[PDB]
Ligand binder design. Structure first.
Ligand SMILES: CCCCCCCC/C=C\CCCCCCCC(=O)O[C@@H](COC(=O)CCCCCCCCCCCCCCC)COP(=O)([O-])OCC[N+](C)(C)C
Ligand SMILES: CCCCCCC/C=C/CCCCCCCCC(=O)OC[C@H](CO)OC(=O)CCCCCCCC/C=C/CCCCCCC
Ligand SMILES: CC(C)CCC[C@@H](C)[C@H]1CC[C@H]2[C@@H]3CC=C4C[C@@H](OC(=O)CCC(=O)O)CC[C@]4(C)[C@H]3CC[C@]12C
Ligand SMILES: CC(C)CCC[C@@H](C)[C@H]1CC[C@H]2[C@@H]3CC=C4C[C@@H](OC(=O)CCC(=O)O)CC[C@]4(C)[C@H]3CC[C@]12C
Ligand SMILES: [Ca+2]
Lengths: 99, 147
């Protein structure tokens, strides 16, 4: 992309692409604050359930980050919320927060 | 718990032999004390704002309602945890005064207070501790809205 501006057909495209990348950086910062809100909140909810979950989704901070990030592209299942125990109150809170 | 809890939710770890497990789980820490003080101060400020202006003046603001909502849940979670702590304390007091059976392993406790030696799996679905952390997670999420 460094030598791309030299072309008349692809020059304007690479310039406009760089403009949007700068533009979305400000919007990405706002989503980071939202992303960090649910990462801490859902990790706290599911930290105590390590061996009591279908998967290890929200158990640790790293895994809470991984589960929430890949939910952006629809690559995280809804079974991230389901608990093995009958603590339906905590499970339904996870359903609402994830929703 | 940043890297997770070493102990499984099925095993109870008590520091000293005659401790009720629920006492250790539900006891407040120093960080818990500061958070409660912080929430109490923020709730106090919100009440003064409401008192001087009245309901209608205060109720029609997006930040004021959300601040009242997150502080109500924060107080709700702490009240539930204190109720769970009080129940554990009642079991603990009975244990150290009516049981002399060397670490609460061989002795069979009455079912009312025997429940306070169970791990997370055997907890009731509606016991205050589970309700406490269920509501506490909601308040933590709502906190970052004030950013
Ligand atoms: C006024 C304030 C304080 C209120 C305190 C009230 C305390 C009351 C609490 C407990 C009292 C006892 C209740 C009964 C025991 C549990 C019952 C139960 O089974 O649970 C049920 C679910 O329960 C829920 O669904 C709760 C849902 C809360 C939603 C919160 C949304 C927060 C939005 C945050 C937005 C953040 C946005 C951030 C910025 C973007 C499940 O039941 P079931 O599986 O259907 O049953 C099948 C049989
Ligand atoms: C609609 C209102 C009625 C339903 C909500 C109450 C749900 C009742 C419940 O307890 O059950 C949740 C369910 C398992 O029972 O599990 C689920 O699937 C539910 C997961 C989604 C719950 C609804 C999510 C609403 C989204 C609201 C967003 C607010 C606006 C966004 C903020 C914008 C700020 C930038
Ligand atoms: C097809 C596979 C095997 C290789 C593809 C690599 C391309 C992505 C690179 C290799 C050479 C590059 C080109 C080298 C020469 C030019 C001419 C350069 O200037 C011109 O368009 C001619 C008019 C002018 O220079 O004013 C603009 C960039 C461009 C198209 C480059 C565009 C990107 C190219 C095609
Ligand atoms: C402006 C401020 C003062 C609002 C604060 C309201 C709270 C002081 C009240 C309102 C709803 C109450 C809660 C309603 C539901 C429950 C479930 C309850 O669970 C049980 O005790 C049933 C199981 C059992 O222990 O047998 C624990 C207390 C709690 C959190 C209550 C604690 C006191 C709460 C939070
Ligand atoms: Ca206010």
């Amino acid at each position: 992309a460094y030598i791309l501006p030299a072309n008349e057909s692809f020059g304007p495209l690479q310039i406009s692409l760089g403009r949007t990348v700068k533009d979305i950086f400000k919007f990405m910062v706002l989503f980071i604050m939202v992303f960090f809100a649910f990462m801490i909140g859902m990790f706290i909810l599911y930290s105590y359930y390590l061996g009591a979950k279908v998967n290890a989704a929200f158990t640790t901070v790293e895994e809470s980050f991984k589960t929430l990030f890949w939910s952006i592209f629809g690559l995280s299942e809804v079974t991230s919320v389901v608990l093995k125990y009958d603590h339906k109150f905590i499970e339904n809170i996870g359903y609402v927060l994830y929703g | 718990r940043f890297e997770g809890i070493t102990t499984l939710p099925n095993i109870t770890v008590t520091d000293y032999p005659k401790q009720i497990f629920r006492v250790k789980t539900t006891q407040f820490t120093w960080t818990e004390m500061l958070i409660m003080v912080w929430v109490l101060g923020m709730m106090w400020s919100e009440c003064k704002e409401l008192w001087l202006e009245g309901p209608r003046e205060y109720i029609l603001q997006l930040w004021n309602v959300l601040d009242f909502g997150m502080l109500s849940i924060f107080i709700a979670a702490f009240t539930a945890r204190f109720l769970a702590f009080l129940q554990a304390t009642k079991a603990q007091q009975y244990v150290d005064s009516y049981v002399q059976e060397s670490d609460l392993s061989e002795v069979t406790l009455p079912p009312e207070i025997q429940y306070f030696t169970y791990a997370r799996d055997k907890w009731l679905p509606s016991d205050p501790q589970i309700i406490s952390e269920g509501l506490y997670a909601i308040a933590v999420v709502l906190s970052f809205s004030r950013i």
